[PDB]
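lol so apparently i was supposed to do this last week
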Amino acid sequence: ATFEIVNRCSYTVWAAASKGDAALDAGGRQLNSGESWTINVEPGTNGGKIWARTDCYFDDSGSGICKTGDCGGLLRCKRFGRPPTTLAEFSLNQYGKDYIDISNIKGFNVPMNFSPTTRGCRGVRCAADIVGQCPAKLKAPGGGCNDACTVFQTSEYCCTTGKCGPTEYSRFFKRLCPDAFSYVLDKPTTVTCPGSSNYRVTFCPTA
Ligand code: NA
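anyway here it is w/ sodium ion bound
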């Protein structure tokens, strides 16, 4: 599959693409305002995620840190990032079908649109000002809006037993971005696309 990562934000972001135990394509790159990044995800990739990182400083070896989405201090991520991170999640070629979604389960930092560049399905977007409206107890100093599980580490917010209901915090993310996951057992907002589709991820799609 071919993903195009576009940065429409007025500020620089450092994109990342990982499937948990290995990088996706180069793993990460700096994206100035308006820059696009094309990557190739091997068909069958399961559990891949694309996200943005803000306020990064990297050395010549690619080691550094970001205030949001840091993935172990590396520019080229081999691992998911530290919350809060708006997540673009995808499983490809699962019995002739791709599955895509946007998730606020690990917080929110940058507005995001996730849409296919081919035919057969629709796209999902979370472009609200979640950071501006973020409750005080979930605000992250570095920037972004943390999820309740990251903050309070309870069975209910993290849904550890397996059963959990919506909380006051998940409804906040859900009220602003209905098309994104607000908690683990949230009613799936997943989109089903034809196998081997191509996609474009746009940061700050409305600005
Ligand atoms: Na998730």
